[PDB]
């Protein structure tokens, strides 16, 4: 199956989840590409890929506002050709600030609302892939099953 994994990252934490993801998923057999959301186009963004693991960090207090890279994509997501594709989410936060990885439902719940098929519960870490090696393992095993 051929996963893109699709990130958005200001210090780099969610861009090491997504990394440590790339290895994991690679190793199970699968060909798999890493995207900077920097260097990316939303339209058709999906096409040719079976499953797309996105992730960003969130930015905003009260309100919620994703990673500066990922937004417009984000707004821009019924473009990219997820219908029937398999998706799931994960983010780097901070318990400290309010809407702690809100990216993820808000990813979860826009993606289901195209037709893509959310495989699991995305991921949440605080900090980078290492301050929580066991979850980012754990939640990588997940979409291997349903990949
Ligand atoms: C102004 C500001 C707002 C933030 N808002 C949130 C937030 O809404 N939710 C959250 O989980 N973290 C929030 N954070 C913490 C960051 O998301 C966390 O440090 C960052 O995700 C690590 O991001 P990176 O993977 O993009 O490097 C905020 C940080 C700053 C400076």
Same mark, same amino acid.
């Given at each position: 199956?051929?996963?893109?994994?699709?990130?958005?990252?200001?210090?780099? +934490?969610?861009?090491?989840? &997504?990394?440590?993801?790339?290895?994991?998923?690679?190793?199970?057999?699968?060909?798999?590409?890493?995207? +900077? &959301?920097?260097?990316?186009?939303?339209? +058709?963004?999906?096409?040719?890929?079976?499953?797309?693991?996105?992730?960003?960090?969130?930015?905003?207090?009260?309100?919620?506002?994703?990673?500066?890279? #990922?937004?417009?994509? #984000?707004?821009?997501?019924? +473009?990219?050709?997820?219908?029937?594709? /398999?998706? &799931?989410?994960?983010?780097?936060?901070?318990?400290?600030?309010?809407?702690?990885?809100?990216?993820?439902?808000?990813?979860?719940?826009?993606?289901?609302?195209?037709? &893509?098929?959310?495989?699991?519960?995305?991921? /949440?870490?605080?900090?980078?892939?290492?301050?929580?090696?066991?979850?980012?393992?754990? #939640?990588?095993?997940?979409?291997?099953? /349903?990949?």
């Amino acid at each position: 199956s051929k996963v893109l994994i699709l990130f958005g990252s200001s210090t780099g +934490n969610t861009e090491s989840i &997504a990394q440590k993801l790339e290895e994991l998923v690679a190793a199970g057999g699968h060909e798999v590409t890493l995207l +900077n &959301a920097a260097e990316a186009s939303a339209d +058709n963004l999906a096409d040719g890929y079976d499953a797309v693991l996105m992730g960003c960090s969130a930015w905003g207090m009260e309100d919620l506002e994703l990673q500066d890279d #990922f937004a417009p994509l #984000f707004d821009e997501m019924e +473009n990219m050709g997820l219908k029937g594709k /398999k998706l &799931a989410a994960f983010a780097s936060g901070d318990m400290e600030y309010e809407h702690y990885c809100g990216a993820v439902p808000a990813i979860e719940e826009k993606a289901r609302g195209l037709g &893509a098929e959310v495989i699991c519960e995305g991921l /949440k870490i605080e900090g980078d892939a290492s301050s929580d090696p066991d979850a980012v393992s754990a #939640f990588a095993e997940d979409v291997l099953k /349903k990949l």
